[PDB]
Amino acid sequence: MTTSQKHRDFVAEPMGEKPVGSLAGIGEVLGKKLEERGFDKAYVVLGQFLVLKKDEDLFREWLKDTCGANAKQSRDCFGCLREWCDAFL
Amino acid sequence: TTSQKHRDFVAEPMGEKPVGSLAGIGEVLGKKLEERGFDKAYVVLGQFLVLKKDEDLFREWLKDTCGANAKQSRDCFGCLREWCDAFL
């Protein structure tokens, strides 16, 4: 297993009302910028992931444009949502 | 009360179910949603979540997007809200 423990904790259970900072790749700096743009809970970012039909390129570009995520951060966030969806959606 | 379509939707993960599986979303509405990119139920779930599960804003969005009436948008909202309470 090469994922972060933080990825593993997120994909292991329904997300409920978890804050956006529970997402893999979303540290405190990215989290605050997402919160300022209205993406305050992880499920709101899931929402954008789903509205983009789970497309990696569109989602990672959206994350970059919205909070300045770098490639690793956007890959980790995308991967965490993709695996959560595979488990629970 | 609820339809059986609602109960069937809220009882299980939606996976790749088409948009027409949502309560309230019949053939006409489903066609119009598909034409605008919302071809699977989870894409509509996505919009519900992006709108922070806000009943008024989601139902208005559904009306503006596919012409759903008050009953249709009511049923679609309720099915998504109850699905989320069970699985999200």
What are the DSSP calls for A25-48, one per residue? T--HHHHHHHHHTT--BHHHHHHH
Angle among Cα A83, B51, A76 to the nearest 5 degrees reads: 25
Angle among Cα B43, A18, A76 to the nearest 5 degrees reads: 70
Compute how many other C-beta atoms are within 10 angstroms of the C-beta atom of residue A15: 20
Using a CB-CB distance cutoff of 8 angstroms, which residues of chain A are in contact with residue B40? 53
CA B10 to chain A, closest CA, distance in angstroms equals: 12
How many alpha carbons fall within 13 Å on the CB side of residue A14? 10
- What is the sign of the dihedral through the CA atoms of B72, B75, B78 and B82? negative
Domain locations in chain A as residue ranges: 1-89
Q: How was this structure determined?
A: X-ray
Q: Which residues contact B47 (CB under 8 A, 6 or more apart)?
A: A47, A51, B38, B58, B61
Gap between the Cα atoms of A46 and A66, Å rounded: 14
CA B83 to chain A, closest CA, distance in angstroms equals: 10
Residues B47, A44: C-beta atoms closer than 8 Å = no
For B30, the token pair is 């489903």
Which is nearest to B28 in space by CA: B59, B62, B58? B62
What Å distances lie between residue A34 and A42, A81, B86, CA to CA? Answer: 10, 16, 26
Gap between the Cα atoms of B79 and B41, Å rounded: 11
Q: Residues of B near A (CB-CB distance < 8 A)?
A: 13-15, 37, 40, 42-43, 45-52, 84, 87-88
